[PDB]
Design a protein around this ligand. Structure first.
Ligand code: HEO
Ligand SMILES: CCCCCCCC/C=C/CCCCCCCC(=O)O[C@@H](COC(=O)CCCCCCCCCCCCCCC)COP(=O)([O-])OCC[N+](C)(C)C
Ligand SMILES: CCCCCCCC/C=C/CCCCCCCC(=O)O[C@@H](COC(=O)CCCCCCCCCCCCCCC)COP(=O)([O-])OCC[N+](C)(C)C
Ligand SMILES: CCCCCCCC/C=C\CCCCCCCC(=O)O[C@@H](COC(=O)CCCCCCCCCCCCCCC)COP(=O)([O-])OCC[N+](C)(C)C
Ligand SMILES: CCCCCCCCCCCCCCCCCC(=O)OC[C@H](COP(=O)(O)OCCN)OC(=O)CCCCCCCCCCCCCCCCC
Ligand SMILES: CCCCCCCCCCCCCCCCCC(=O)OC[C@H](COP(=O)(O)OCCN)OC(=O)CCCCCCCCCCCCCCCCC
Ligand code: HEM
Ligand SMILES: [Cu+2]
Lengths: 263, 99, 661, 204
């Protein structure tokens, strides 16, 4: 339709591609679904019992041309939609990096009990429930969980990806337009799932993004080690944006190694 | 009386062979792993068919062919479920490592 | 045994002044209850609870389905009003620790104890009547499976009454369901309800597979069976092939929560993704377990109420069997967002579209059955056209969900919610009310009231659309499922509209109850007196209404598809044979009730960590099984004198109507 | 192979001419055994997925004593062939060969179960239970589900032996021995798949 919703009006290249395939699939299915509903109401009304001047062949129960057509048209619509499914599933794979001359910004995403934790490794900072990145720049999300399965989702920008503990998913996104986009967990995770909800800020340029990084380095609190991590990973709800200025250089690997611990 | 004593005893001897040889190939390591592993899976499969033919009296006309069919459909479901579950889980486990 | 005296208690009532009706007229259906009809009336123990007759067990399966529909619909009203209040800026009346329990319990109650018993009771009613069998292959097993379903219903009701059910979503995904993040007993309630009801369901599936294959009338080949029989066969194949997966998967969750094992436990070599894979490997054949016999009902109803033979029988049968094998290679479409990279996702998307093809063959066959024909607008007919429209809409939204690129933004949103509500409500629930309206005279001997059925249908279809088109819009707006608190205000108005839609469906359910009550107070002015009230083409209408308990004194000989119609065409319907031989019949047994009560004891003691008593309950099931195996007088013969009385009463009513040969 | 519109009796092929048959129950047990095949296959797929989940502990090669598994396999195969000899008695009538062959079958089956119990106890005592690792959990699930099936077959066999000793070789006992024949032979088939997939591949 013509909504200003997050999916019918997306602001990222991945979301625009998904909107295009949603509209294409929707129209291809309308080709076969709209005559079905129209013949449902029309065949209901037209061949009434009270309607004397109809044909009424009660013993006609098989044909070859009707049977051939009603097999044929679903076959052809499913062939076209299947070809488009093949091409678009290989094109919009979340683990596949985006074709872009800008080098991506790597953001590390950890689903805490009911909050979103973010690590910028090459910037060496951390945030809760807020990310920023320059617009028109590819963004590489390395996503894992800390407790249970979640689903990292910025609907205006692109796809979901599951956040699972002890294992690393990866997503590639980009924003085609500066702004502030609501992100959520899209997989229920317990009493607090309604609160785990963040903002992604697409700054208009790199200088505004560097200013947001420089604001994060002024934070008194540091994520220096695992003790600060488990202090922050204590369960809580609806937590505000906070920043961390010093980050242990491989914290993401440490969080995943908590669950791949051998001995 | 579908089974004779001779049918059961030939199934018995075949089962003894198809059990003792894969065990011997694994306990000694005589071949290399590939032509051990393929051998033990082949001999397991043919021993399963020997047990079905000899001990279950399994045939294409026993209950209007519905035993065989039920079994062929069941083997198709086992094939889809097990092989698909291994394929899905291997692709997932590849895609969860710290690249 | 000898003094059960057991009834149930009222769940709850909440006051909400949101739009002054949700919470007040929600109470108007919450207060629908009845006083004792003499609990363990000796008539009720002898003729209903111990009954191995398939007609009564089917009726009882539906009674359970309607009662659980009322309870879970009350839960759905509270959810919808809470979502409407929480998007308006207020803390609602439902905290998250109650709301999460409510949607987990509600989805469980709906799927299992509403959608399963109604379709299984419909098969128990009319499948042995359709194939010309006097009863099912395993009658005691049918009674035992009923009572296992009742045990599962009991477990979920006790958990909801106490306030301790699972809080994980209706499928209990594993890390959350783990003993670590859910230490409470509610997941155990979930576990043992699905175990005992799944044993019952597996027994039903085996029983109907053997009944359909082995006990149809002579002359009925495979391609002369009725369509509802073919659909029942196919859904029972799916039950047999899929419910062991549910049994193993929930048993593995049981071992994770009771023995401290590490199947899905995230740290010690476990893999929670294996549970999600296995649970959806069960759960997508569950879909077509629900939708196949409903497709059979709709084919039967369209054929009989179009006054025309069903169009393209062989193509629609092969479409049923095509759906039946295909349902097993599509289950990854519930997790595209997990992270199989594009090859597996592409494969399962293609196979889900391959599902979408023979369903279209079904739909267009039902259209071209109606392409000629004096179509009388019965209640069941209106349910059929409303199903075609609604299910077409839901099916195209699911094929939109089947694309992995589209699913990457639509997974776990309210678009998916509105999908499965579209297809389940339209297909399954419209088929429920269509089949109940269609076979009520065959169940009881009198017709349902027509105008209240029309009113219930119109409220159901309009209120469904008002309730669930905003969830399509909301899923496009980015609202995900299972949101409870501090919902974003941009959603609010759509949620408000959905709230109104839920209210309208309430009226239809109220209308349904009213219809039933009216139909019982006007029994004598609305009975049919023959077994053929609508006309009819399959040989369950060749009996009386209600059938005799022995179900065709003389087993019919078929010669042709739609046997009753071709006996009414060339006039050898209603033919009185000279002599009746003796009829073999099993006896009523209370042993299914005892095994069920021991399973109730075992499940409760397993939930509350009694350890002992769980042994006593398990031993009670095994010893009752063995002692029942020791009994020998498991059957009796009905004499020819009682057969002559009933069959003479039937032929007196036929010749009073005016049919002789 | 013909279509007879006029044969209006209940005539069916002879097979001692009763036409109140137990073949419906045999077919029903066969369909149940296909469902239980699917049950065991889901456990097999779980073991295949979780086999490398040796968290910090032992692998299959570290655990499995192949001679002991060989004695287990011989015991259960002997049980299968002795139950097959029990079905040769019935069909030749002559009870007390049924009881003797089922008794030898029961001792062979109780041998198989007792060595399985020995391995389970030896693993749990040495800190190597199902709660140690995912591989050990899947091993215990698959092997112990087969053991629970063999155990339930042993209770069914003892109850059936008591019923044959009391009531003789009745028509009820016909279909009961054939149902348990299906169950027991299928259990030996499942164990063939078990020692191939779990033990032989594990101790490779
Ligand atoms: C019994 C109800 C039912 C029915 C009938 C269906 C039928 C279908 N199921 Fe819906 N499923 C059902 C029950 C569910 N499925 C679900 C989830 C679900 C998802 C999850 C997406 C996600 O993860 O977000 C997908 C892709 C599908 C695919 C389908 C498809 C393609 C059909 C098709 O078979 C529909 C076929 C009908 C059509 C297509 C319309 C008829 C018109 C035709 C056919 C004309 C020709 C058109 C074409 C050929 C395109 N199922 C869930 C979610 C569970 C949860 O959320 O926890 C439930 C309950
Ligand atoms: C209990 C706790 C454990 C849980 C066990 C759970 C199972 C419990 C099962 C219990 C079953 C027993 C109750 C119903 C029996 C009706 C038939 C009968 O007995 O004949 C009656 C004659 O006819 C009548 O008087 C009414 C006939 C239709 C009633 C339909 C009720 C259900 C409708 C819903 C949909 C049905 C399915 C529709 C499918 C298409 C005899 O009279 P009566 O029955 O003594 O009087 C009934 C009272 N009434 C007159 C006010 C009505
Ligand atoms: C991963 C999850 C694993 C789950 C599965 C674990 C293993 C599950 C294993 C299941 C296999 C056992 C089922 C088959 C039993 C026989 C059925 C049959 O056809 O009856 C035949 C004979 O039967 C008899 O004579 C009665 C049966 C004897 C008692 C059986 C005790 C089983 C104990 C354990 C029970 C399960 C314990 C489960 C523990 C968890 C024919 O019947 P009939 O001649 O018509 O008359 C019989 C009399 N009756 C009508 C009363 C029947
Ligand atoms: C799993 C086991 C599954 C049971 C497998 C049964 C297979 C039956 C095959 C068909 C057959 O011959 O039926 C006939 C005999 O069979 C019976 O009557 C069987 C009765 C089974 C009772 C099981 C209850 C306890 C479940 C155990 C687990 C509970 C606790 C789990 C934790 C039907 O007899 P009829 O003609 O109706 O008389
Ligand atoms: C499907 C069914 C199987 C699901 C898994 C059940 C596992 C049993 C859990 C036992 C819990 C426990 O720790 O028991 C302690 C108790 C002493 O141990 C005991 O001695 C009592 C254990 C009783 C278990 C129930 C027996 C029937 C199963
Ligand atoms: C699906 C099936 C999965 C089965 C998983 C079984 C897991 C068992 C978990 C046990 C937890 C710890 C129990 C413990 O420490 O108890 C030790 C105790 C040994 O002492 P005692 O009671 O004398 O033993 C009698 C029988 N040997 O008693 C024991 O526990 C020892 C016996 C071990 C279990 C043997 C039987 C297992 C099932 C066989 C089929
Ligand atoms: C008028 C009828 C119904 C209404 C108003 C209704 C409403 C709802 C709502 C609001 C939810 C939660 C959606 C969310 O997450 O925000 C839900 C979940 C669900 N409903 Fe219904 N529902 C209805 C009927 C049914 C029926 C008939 C079924 C039959 C199977 C069903 C099965 C489910 C399932 C499986 C879930 C998901 C449970 C979960 O989230 O864990 N519903 N329903
Ligand atoms: Cu699905």
């Amino acid at each position: 339709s013509g909504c200003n919703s997050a999916l019918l009006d997306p602001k990222g290249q991945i979301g625009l591609e998904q909107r295009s395939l949603i509209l294409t699939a929707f129209g291809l299915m309308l080709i076969v679904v709209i005559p079905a509903i129209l013949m449902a109401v029309g065949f209901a009304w037209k061949y009434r019992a009270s309607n004397k001047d109809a044909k009424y062949s009660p013993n006609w129960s098989h044909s070859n041309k009707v049977e051939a057509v009603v097999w044929t048209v679903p076959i052809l619509i499913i062939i076209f939609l299947a070809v488009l499914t093949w091409k678009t599933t290989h094109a919009l794979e979340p683990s596949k990096p985006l074709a872009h001359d800008e080098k991506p910004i790597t953001i590390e995403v950890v689903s805490m009990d009911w909050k979103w934790f973010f690590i910028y490794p090459e910037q060496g900072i951390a945030t809760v429930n807020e990310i920023a990145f320059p617009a028109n720049t590819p963004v590489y999300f390395k996503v894992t969980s800390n407790s249970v399965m979640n689903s990292f989702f910025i609907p205006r920008l692109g796809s979901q990806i599951y956040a699972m503990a002890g294992m690393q998913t990866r997503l590639h996104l980009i924003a085609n337009e500066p702004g502030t986009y609501d992100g959520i967990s899209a997989s229920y995770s317990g009493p607090g799932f309604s609160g785990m909800k963040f903002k992604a800020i697409a700054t208009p340029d790199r200088a505004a993004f560097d200013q947001w990084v420089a604001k994060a380095k002024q934070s008194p609190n540091t994520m220096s080690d695992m003790a600060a991590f488990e202090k922050l990973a204590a369960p809580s709800e609806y937590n505000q944006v906070e920043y961390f200025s010093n980050v242990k250089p491989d914290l993401f690997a440490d969080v995943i190694n908590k669950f791949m611990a051998h001995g | 009386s579908h089974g004779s004593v001779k049918t059961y005893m030939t199934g018995f001897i075949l089962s003894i062979i198809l059990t003792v040889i894969p065990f011997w190939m694994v306990m000694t390591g005589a071949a290399s792993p590939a032509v051990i592993l393929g051998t033990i899976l082949a001999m397991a499969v043919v021993q399963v068919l020997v047990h079905l033919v000899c001990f279950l009296h399994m045939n294409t006309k026993s209950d209007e062919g519905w035993n065989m069919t039920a079994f062929v459909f069941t083997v198709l479901i086992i094939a889809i479920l097990v092989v698909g579950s291994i394929w899905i889980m291997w692709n997932l486990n590849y895609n969860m490592m710290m690249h | 045994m000898f003094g059960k005296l057991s009834l149930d208690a009222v769940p709850f009532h909440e006051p909400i002044v949101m739009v002054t009706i949700a919470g007040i007229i929600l109470g108007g259906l919450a207060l629908v209850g009845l006083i004792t009809y003499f609990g363990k009336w000796t008539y009720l123990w002898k003729e209903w609870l111990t009954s191995v007759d398939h007609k009564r067990l089917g009726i009882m399966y539906i009674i359970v389905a309607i009662v659980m529909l009322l309870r879970g619909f009350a839960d759905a009203i509270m959810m919808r009003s809470q979502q409407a209040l929480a998007s308006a800026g207020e803390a609602g009346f439902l905290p998250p620790h109650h709301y999460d329990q409510i949607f987990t319990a509600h989805g469980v109650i709906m799927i299992f104890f509403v959608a399963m018993p109604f379709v299984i009771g419909l098969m128990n009613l009319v499948v042995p009547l359709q194939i010309g069998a006097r009863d099912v292959a395993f009658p005691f097993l049918n009674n035992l499976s009923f009572w296992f379903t009742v045990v599962g219903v009991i477990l979920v009701n006790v958990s909801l009454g106490v306030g301790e059910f699972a809080q994980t979503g209706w499928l209990a995904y594993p890390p959350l369901s783990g003993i670590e993040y859910s230490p409470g007993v509610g997941v155990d309630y979930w576990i043992w309800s699905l175990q005992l009801s799944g044993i019952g369901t597996t027994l039903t599936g085996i029983n109907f597979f053997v009944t359909i294959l082995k006990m149809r009338a002579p002359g009925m080949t495979m391609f002369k069976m009725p369509v509802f029989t073919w659909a029942s066969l196919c859904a029972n194949v799916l039950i047999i092939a899929s419910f062991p997966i549910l049994t193993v998967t929930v048993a593995l969750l049981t071992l994770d929560r009771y023995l401290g094992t590490h199947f899905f436990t995230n740290d010690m070599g476990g893999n929670m993704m294996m549970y999600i894979n296995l649970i959806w490997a069960w759960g997508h054949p569950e879909v077509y377990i629900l939708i196949l016999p409903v497709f059979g009902v709709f084919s039967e109803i369209a054929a009989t109420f179009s006054r025309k033979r069903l169009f393209g029988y062989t193509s629609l049968v092969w479409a049923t069997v095509c759906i039946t094998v295909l349902s097993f290679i599509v289950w990854l479409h519930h997790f595209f967002t997990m992270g199989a990279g594009a090859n597996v996702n592409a494969f399962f998307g293609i196979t889900t579209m391959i599902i979408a093809i023979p369903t279209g063959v079904k739909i267009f066959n039902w259209l071209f059955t109606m392409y000629q024909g004096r179509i009388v607008f019965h209640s069941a007919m209106l349910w059929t056209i409303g199903f075609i429209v609604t299910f077409s809409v839901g099916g195209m939204t699911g094929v939109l969900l089947a694309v992995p690129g589209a699913d990457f933004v639509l997974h776990n949103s309210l678009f998916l919610i509105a999908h499965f509500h579209n297809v389940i409500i339209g297909g399954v629930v419209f088929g429920c009310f269509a089949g109940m309206t269609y076979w009520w005279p065959k169940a009881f001997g009198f017709k349902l009231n027509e105008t209240w059925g029309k009113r219930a249908f119109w409220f159901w279809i309009i209120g469904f659309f008002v309730a669930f088109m905003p969830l399509y819009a909301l899923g496009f707006m980015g609202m995900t499922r299972r949101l409870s608190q501090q919902i974003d205000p941009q959603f609010h108005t759509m949620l408000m509209i959905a709230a109104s839609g839920a209210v309208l469906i309430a009226l239809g359910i109220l209308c349904l109850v009213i219809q039933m009550y009216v139909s019982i107070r006007d029994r004598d002015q609305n009975r049919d007196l023959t077994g053929d009230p609508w006309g009819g083409r399959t040989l369950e209408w060749a009996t009386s209404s209600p059938p005799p308990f022995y179900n065709f004194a003389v087993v019919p000989h078929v010669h042709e598809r739609d046997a009753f119609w071709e006996m009414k065409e060339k006039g050898e319907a209603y033919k009185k044979p000279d002599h009746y031989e003796e009829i073999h019949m099993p006896k009523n047994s209370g042993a299914g009730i005892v095994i069920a009560a021991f399973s109730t004891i075992f499940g409760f003691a397993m939930i509350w960590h009694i350890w002992w008593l769980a042994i006593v309950g398990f031993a009670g099931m095994i010893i009752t099984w063995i002692v029942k195996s020791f009994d020998e007088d498991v059957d009796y013969y009905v004499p020819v004198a009682e057969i002559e009385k009933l069959e003479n009463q039937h032929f007196d009513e036929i010749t009073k109507a005016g049919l002789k040969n | 192979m013909a279509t007879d519109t006029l044969t209006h009796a209940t005539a069916h092929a002879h097979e001692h001419g009763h036409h109140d048959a137990g073949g419906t129950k045999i077919f029903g047990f066969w369909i149940y055994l296909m469902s239980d095949c699917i049950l065991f296959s889901i456990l097999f797929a779980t073991y295949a997925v979780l086999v490398n989940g040796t968290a910090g502990g032992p692998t299959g090669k570290d655990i499995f004593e192949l001679p002991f598994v060989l004695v287990e396999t011989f015991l259960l195969l002997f049980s299968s062939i002795t139950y097959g000899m029990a079905a040769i008695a019935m069909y030749k009538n002559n009870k007390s060969q049924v009881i003797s062959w089922l008794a030898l079958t029961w001792l062979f089956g109780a041998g198989f179960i007792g060595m399985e119990i020995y391995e389970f106890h030896h693993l749990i005592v040495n800190g190597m239970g199902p709660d140690r690792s995912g591989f050990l959990s899947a091993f215990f699930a698959l092997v112990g589900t087969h053991g629970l099936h063999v155990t339930s077959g042993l209770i069914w066999m003892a109850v059936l032996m008591v019923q044959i000793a009391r009531r003789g070789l009745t028509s009820t006992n016909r279909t009961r021995i054939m149902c348990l024949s299906l169950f027991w032979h299928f259990l030996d088939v499942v164990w063939i798949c078990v020692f191939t997939v779990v033990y032989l591949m594990g101790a490779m």
